[PDB]
């Protein structure tokens, strides 16, 4: 039965190099080819290539040039994933498993240790530099809401740490205001939007505000949405 | 060349859900299909290998087919230990590698489906003025928790610059998600539209926006 171990998890800057151990327990190493896979936080499967483990011999897929290299230690069983000048959009977990060779047909030989996982290995790559956000307003539109209705909002752009508190005019507009669960960019930085829908005959005379706080930079913004 | 599999997948306990995994001759077509188990947070499993054939452990509920250049997993008996994200792959002649499918989630219903509502804003006046364009796609009101966004520019698909929540639940006990297209200004400009494109189980919805 395989079992691969995997190097634990890994907190880097952007520029720094990283080395991912991927360890064969309880099985023959040269038996099967390592495949590595990554996936970004929330996301899907990205194959990156494989290494022989006979040969040593590695093979890239398109996406993965220069800073991602395979490397092997056959004197312990260990096949190595390292990622040069780490970039914040290499944020994700890598995996390594074994793997199948192409088959002609179903004829021949098949183990089930051909594909078996790795729990991955989480690698970080972020400054942690505190920014304070952009905040830009989302003038409303009535395409989405209901009859006599429209959506404006705030778009809160590029700030680090979490969090980010939205408030509608100070407190006082509650009622069909949703702030959306900020996304973490491949940039390392979040963005959110908070949005509200209010009736379309105020726009000519209800002020709409939104109140950005971001404690991590002490930064409070009140920006005025106007159609 | 990409496996295109459906956002999310559902039925009620014991019903059976059966999971596209749609490709190209050059991989479906001219090399074998593999389906993978992957609970989140956890490692994927091997679930089907050679498009057909299970390994030890794996119940025969589950089941895999290959028709010409698509494939597809049929889980009968659906319960709640099923849920999970499953990938389909196989070997692409073009990329020469091994693809992956972009995943399908699939959800025992606590709740009939719901369709997503779709909001798409433009760059404010006020960015373009800082010298970048940001185009807002949000996605309310939809369940099963699972959507594919893809955004197009003048309706070709644009892959650059996008960032994409998973689904949450809001008050209303619906999932929503928001996307994220970012451009330059002279791009913004320059084309005629873009579009935010949601899938999600029957529905597409696809919002455009012009400068
Ligand atoms: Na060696
Ligand atoms: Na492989
Ligand atoms: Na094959
Ligand atoms: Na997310």
């Known amino acids: 039965q395989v079992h691969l171990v995997q190097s634990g998890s890994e907190l880097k800057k952007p520029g720094a190099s990283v080395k991912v151990s991927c360890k064969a327990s309880?099985?023959?190493?040269?038996?099967?080819?390592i495949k590595w896979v990554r996936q970004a936080p929330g996301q899907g499967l990205e194959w990156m290539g494989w290494?022989?483990?006979?040969?040593?011999?590695?093979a890239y897929a398109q996406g993965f040039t220069g800073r991602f290299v395979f490397s092997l230690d056959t004197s312990v069983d260990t096949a190595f994933l390292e990622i040069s000048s780490l970039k914040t959009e290499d944020t994700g977990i890598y995996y390594c498993?074994?793997?199948?060779?192409?088959?002609?047909?179903?004829?021949?030989?098949?183990?089930?240790?051909?594909?078996?996982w790795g729990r991955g290995t989480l690698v970080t790559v972020s400054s942690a530099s505190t920014k304070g956000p952009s905040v830009f307003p989302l003038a409303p539109s009535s395409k989405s809401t209901s009859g006599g209705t429209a959506a404006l909002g705030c778009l809160v752009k590029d700030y680090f740490p979490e969090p980010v508190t939205v408030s509608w005019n100070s407190g006082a507009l509650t009622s069909g205001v949703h702030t959306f669960p900020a996304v973490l960019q491949s940039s390392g930085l979040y963005s959110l939007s908070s949005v509200v829908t209010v009736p379309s005959s105020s726009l000519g005379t209800q002020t709409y505000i939104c109140n950005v706080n971001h404690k991590p930079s002490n930064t409070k913004v009140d920006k005025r949405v106007e159609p | 060349s990409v496996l295109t599999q459906p956002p999310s997948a559902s039925g009620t306990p014991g019903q059976s859900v059966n999971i596209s995994c749609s490709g190209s001759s050059s991989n479906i077509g001219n090399s074998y299909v593999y389906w993978y188990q992957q609970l989140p947070g956890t490692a994927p499993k091997l679930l089907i290998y050679?498009?057909?054939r299970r390994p030890s452990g794996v119940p025969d509920r589950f089941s895999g087919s290959k028709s010409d250049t698509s494939a597809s997993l049929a889980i009968s008996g659906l319960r709640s230990e099923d849920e999970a994200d499953y990938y389909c792959?196989?070997?692409?002649?073009?990329?020469?590698?091994?693809?992956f499918g972009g995943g399908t989630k699939l959800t025992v219903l606590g709740q009939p489906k719901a369709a997503p509502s779709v909001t798409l804003f433009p760059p404010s006046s006020e960015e373009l003025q800082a010298n970048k364009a940001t185009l807002v796609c949000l996605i309310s009101d939809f369940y099963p928790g699972a959507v594919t966004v893809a955004w197009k520019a003048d309706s070709s698909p644009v892959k650059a610059g996008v960032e994409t929540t998973t689904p949450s639940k809001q008050s209303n006990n619906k999932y929503a998600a928001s996307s994220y297209l970012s451009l330059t200004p002279e791009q913004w400009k320059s084309h005629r539209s873009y579009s935010c494109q949601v899938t999600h189980e029957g529905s597409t919805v696809e919002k455009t926006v012009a400068p």
């Open positions: 309880g099985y023959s190493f040269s038996r099967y080819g």
């Open positions: 050679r498009n057909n």
């Open positions: 792959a196989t070997w692409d002649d073009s990329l020469s590698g091994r693809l």
């Open positions: 498993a074994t793997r199948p060779p192409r088959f002609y047909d179903k004829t021949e030989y098949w183990e089930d240790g051909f594909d078996v």
């Open positions: 290494i022989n483990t006979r040969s040593g011999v590695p």
